[PDB]
Amino acid sequence: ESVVEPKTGFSFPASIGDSRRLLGVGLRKKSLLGLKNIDVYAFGVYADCDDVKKLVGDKYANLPASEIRGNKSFMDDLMEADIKMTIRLQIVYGKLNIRSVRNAFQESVGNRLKKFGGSDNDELLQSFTSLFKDEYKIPRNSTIDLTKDPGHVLSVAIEGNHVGSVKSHLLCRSILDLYIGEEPFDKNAREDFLDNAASLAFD
Numbered sequence: 104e105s106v107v108e109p110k111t112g113f114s115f116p117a118s119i120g121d122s123r124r125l126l127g128v129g130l131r132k133k134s135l136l137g138l139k140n141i142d143v144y145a146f147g148v149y150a151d152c153d154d155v156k157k158l159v160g161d162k163y164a165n166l167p168a169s170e171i172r173g174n175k176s177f178m179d180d181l182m183e184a185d186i187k188m189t190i191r192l193q194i195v196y197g198k199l200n201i202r203s204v205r206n207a208f209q210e211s212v213g214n215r216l217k218k219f220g221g222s223d224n225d226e227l228l229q230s231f232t233s234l235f236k237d238e239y240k241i242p243r244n245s246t247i248d249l250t251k252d253p254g255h256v257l258s259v260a261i262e263g264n265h266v267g268s269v270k271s272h273l274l275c276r277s278i279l280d281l282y283i284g285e286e287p288f289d290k291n292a293r294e295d296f297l298d299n300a301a302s303l304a305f306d
């Protein structure tokens with residue numbers, strides 16, 4: 104059964120393709136001046152069950168969920184492992200403009216690329232940006248699917264239409280870090296993701 108993000112009311116399927124399970128749902132906000140804040144989009148983080156089970160079975164053999172979750176290394180082990188994942192975004196804010204959005208993800212993704220990769224990923228960041236070169240609008244209720252395909256290949260689909268891919272371990276890691284890393288857009292979503300990822304191997 105679908106999972107509804109309460110604040111926005113947006114719904115996310117419990118799974119995608121029977122193999123990719125929804126583990127966490129959150130909101131990406133934009134902090135404005137003072138007490139002003141805007142909910143930009145809701146997101147759902149999915150992970151392939153078999154891939155997660157293999158990681159746990161290999162690095163956390165015979166350990167209970169609580170002990171797996173209790174390991175400070177768990178989060179980084181998941182992100183670095185070859186685990187197929189999907190980040191589904193559903194636009195909440197209705198007055199976004201393409202220029203503003205491009206500058207926003209260039210900054211967020213850019214911040215992460217320099218954090219994890221060579222001090223010169225401009226071309227890498229540009230290959231990502233180019234995926235949205237044909238988009239002129241980004242209205243409320245639009246759905247974007249960012250997927251980590253085998254071999255750390257980042258694929259993007261907008262409104263159900265595949266728009267391109269970029270094979271880069273660095274890019275995959277950077278983007279995922281925004282949602283499930285040390286400094287995520289939504290801490291509650293990250294905690295749920297880690298809690299459920301830890302439990303997923305025992306289903």
Ligand SMILES: CCCCCCCCCCCC(=O)O
Nearest residue numbers: 133141143198203204207208
């Ligand atoms: C899909 C990428 C979402 C990131 C875009 C965030 C940009 C914030 C919008 C600015 C809010 C405002 O209109 O004052």
Ligand SMILES: CCCCCCCCCCCC(=O)O
Nearest residue numbers: 131207208211235238240241
């Ligand atoms: C016109 C389509 C624009 C969609 C851009 C999707 C980019 C995903 C990364 C967003 C990270 C962030 O929230 O800053």
Ligand SMILES: [K+]
Nearest residue numbers: 134135137139
């Ligand atoms: K604020």
